Amino acid sequence: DSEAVVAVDAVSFTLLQDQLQSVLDTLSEREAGVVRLRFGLTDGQPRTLDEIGQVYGVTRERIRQIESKTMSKLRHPSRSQVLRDYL
């Protein structure tokens, strides 16, 4: 049955999703929420930066600035070392 759950992925998928909270929360909460809807993970719709302006009251370019603020400081291996085991 091709539709079989490997059941290592599922447990590991929960672990992915939980390391996600543990990493986002260790990051700023504004940014954590920004990405939670930008990729629309907790929801069904990833968002563009001008939808975020209403929910977060700031110019879309400022979320352009925050996206890199997330990624680069994430790009410090400290976040990467604990997440690179997830592949």
Partner: protein, 213 residues
């Protein structure tokens, strides 16, 4: 005359290289990382251990490479591992464990005994932080000089702000700042109407430094 650095976890120069005892060139040892750049001071030579671990030595020479201006960087392998030895490591020589005393000494004297080039109609001075273009006076402050130099140094290599923050900035990165825009506009205006087409914008991805002509 020289100090030699071995980026090795063998903790000893003679198991790594037997001839290094017969030469009075003194060797300090550090573990196999790139971070051991902080370990080296006035040492004119640094070697990467690649005898037992080949791709680790290739990566450490990649990290230890020609950036500035540059220090003699060496790496030592066995004989069957000589195929992976290429120019893409970042080297001036190759050493083996079968290399002798006079051989090691002469290759070291070859690397220590070349000059940076920066022409685009655009005088670039890596140490001087000085810029000229279509005239002696081209005032380049620190942020736009390395910036422009990176572009001119990578003429045509389409660059995006994300790519500049880790190179032109440190950086945090304090990215998505648009400060490249005002920085490039200054570079556009300061460089004058002529040579203003070298730094051209390619949309949605950033800019590239058009070569002359």
């Amino acid at each position: 005359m020289l100090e030699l650095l071995l980026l090795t976890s063998e903790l000893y120069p003679d198991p790594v290289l037997p001839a290094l005892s017969l030469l009075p060139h003194t060797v300090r040892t550090a573990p196999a990382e790139a971070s051991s750049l902080l370990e080296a001071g006035n040492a004119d030579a640094v070697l990467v251990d690649a005898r037992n671990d080949l791709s680790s030595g290739r990566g450490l020479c990649r990290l230890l490479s020609s950036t500035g201006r540059s220090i003699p960087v060496l790496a030592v392998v066995s004989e069957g591992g000589l195929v992976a030895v290429s120019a893409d490591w970042g080297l001036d020589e190759i050493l083996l464990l079968s290399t002798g005393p006079a051989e090691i000494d002469a290759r070291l004297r070859l690397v220590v005994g070349l000059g940076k080039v920066s022409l685009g109609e655009l005088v670039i001075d890596e140490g001087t932080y000085t810029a000229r273009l279509r005239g002696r006076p081209l005032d380049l402050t620190y942020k736009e000089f390395e910036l422009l130099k990176y572009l001119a140094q990578h003429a045509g290599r389409v660059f995006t702000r994300a790519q500049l923050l880790h190179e032109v900035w440190g950086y945090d990165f304090f990215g998505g700042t648009r400060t490249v825009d005002v920085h490039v506009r200054r570079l556009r205006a300061k460089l004058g109407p002529e040579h203003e087409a070298l730094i051209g914008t390619v949309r949605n991805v950033g800019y590239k430094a058009v070569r002359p002509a």
